[PDB]
Copies of this chain bind each other. A is one copy, B any other.
Amino acid sequence: HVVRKAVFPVAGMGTRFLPATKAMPKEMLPVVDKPLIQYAVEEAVAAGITDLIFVTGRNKRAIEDHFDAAPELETDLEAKGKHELLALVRDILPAHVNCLYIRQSAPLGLGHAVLTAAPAVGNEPFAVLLADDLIDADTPVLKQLIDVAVARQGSVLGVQEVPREDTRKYGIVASQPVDARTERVTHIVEKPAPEQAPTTLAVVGRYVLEAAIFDHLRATTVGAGNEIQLTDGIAALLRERDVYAHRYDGKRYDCGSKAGMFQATVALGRKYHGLIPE
């Protein structure tokens, strides 16, 4: 049981961030000085991922141009003695890592986005990271989730308790503990109304999934908001396989919203840059 490939769905419409997202996806929006996606990609590489798979929509070259080499810059910086910046540019992506780009025909849902990656993953377990869920942790959260998958030979979702008023935002897991941080998922519902949400334990955008999910996604139909939900492909996988929920150790920011991106800017400005509101 080995995970070396990760999928980054970056093909949503990002309408919550117009006009900022007219020419770039929301996952290219920066927190201080780094795009959301590079945070997630850094986590995945730290977790052992070697093969990055990006599912693009509008402004696809924005992502491609960020992670592909730019020797016009690399040459220019190496000229001006700007050594620190230059290796900072290489630190964006280490040499061994590969990037490959697939196009989503339409933004038909998170689940349809992942199914799009099936030819690239092939038949092996794989990660999924939603970069709008920015997580700051001492140990990479994806490394946390993979360890669980190997031990228990099953899928793993990252999860945290949320307010019951916010369940229209998340897939909500009903589960039974196996250890202090891990539970086995027996039901999962996408964006339940607060009154019917089974629990308050919600899925964050960090997944480790067995290849079996793809067939369950080819059979998946539109659910919440008339979208093909990854959650509903996990719900079909549940009947057949083991799915776990792990309360990872780390701090998540809802950068899919203007308010949580503000808090990410404030918190991480202070932590990694020394920036304090005047």
Contact = CB atoms under 8 A, between A and B. Distances in A.
Q: How many copies does the complex hold?
A: 2
B58 A72 contact: yes
A278 B32 CA distance: 17
A130 B19 CA distance: 20
A19 B278 CA distance: 25
Contact of A263 (B107, B262, B278): B278
Contact of A85 (B15, B73, B92, B265): B15
Contact of A19 (B23, B38, B269): B38
Given A24-B28, A259-B275, 11 more contacts: A15-B77, A19-B33, A19-B92, A23-B28, A23-B66, A24-B24, A29-B30, A58-B73, A61-B65, A263-B278, A266-B266
Interface of A: 13, 15-20, 22-24, 28-30, 32-35, 38, 58-59, 61-66, 70, 72-73, 76-77, 82, 85, 88-89, 92, 107, 258-259, 262-263, 265-267, 269, 273, 275, 277-278
A208 to B, nearest CB: 27
A86 to B, nearest CB: 10
Contact of A92 (B22, B34, B269, B277): B22
Contact of A262 (B65, B82, B88, B265): B265
